Structures are given as C-alpha cells and as structure tokens.
C-alpha cells in the first residue's frame, strides 16, 4: 500500500521534479526500498534523478508528468548547464524505449524535437511504465 495516499504518481512514472532554487528536473518515481533511506511521508514520493542517480523525497505537488514537456523544459538551463543536457539524454532515452520509438548533442537533437513536439505518434501514453 506504498503511496496509497490519494495523490498522483506511482512507481516507474517519469516526472519533472521541482526543488527550491533549481529548475524542473527529470526523474523517475521509485519505491522507498530502492533508496536505502525510509518510507516516504504521506503526500510525498521518492524520486531518482536522471543524470546523477541520486534520491530525493518530493511532495506530489512538486511533481508533474514528464509528458508535459514543453511546459517544463527550461531552455535557459539547457543552454547553460551540461548536467541538464546529460539529464535530458538519459530521461528521453528511457521515454524512447518505453514508447517503442526509434531515431535514425547530436544524439539529443531528434529526441528533444520528439519530446518538444508531443512525443508523436504515441503521445504521453507511450511513456507509461510496463
């Protein structure tokens, strides 16, 4: 009954997570058992950040589906930080495999165009965990 608090987001979900002083960052919702920490408080979820693999306990109100991409993608942070560019690659690679998508900085370009364009042809349904 982990995360049975009435709030959104379950294990395996791709999300944007917001920490104070940082841009919205891509992550995956994980079970507390993967963290080596403790059970999350009601209303909170454990997430693992793409690019650095670290764990954080984040309020479900500070998470949004990764699928709301153009809405949370930060162009200024993308241009400024190589760590954000690397996080985008790992998050969009996970999204690509889940959606059954195939592509023909250079690797990132068509993945970013696919994400910004609404993850066509599956849309956001293709990012759901199996």
Author numbering: 215 to 318, 326 to 351
Mind quoting what the paper says about this structure?
The PWWP domain comprises 100–130 amine acids and is often present in chromatin-associated proteins. Our structures revealed that the overall fold of the PWWP domain consists of three motifs: a canonical β-barrel core, an insertion motif between the second and third β-strands and a C-terminal α-helix bundle. The canonical β-barrel core harbors an aromatic cage constructed by three aromatic residues, which is a signature feature of the Tudor domain “Royal family”. Taken together, similar to other members in the ‘Royal family’, PWWP domain also exhibits methyllysine histone binding ability.
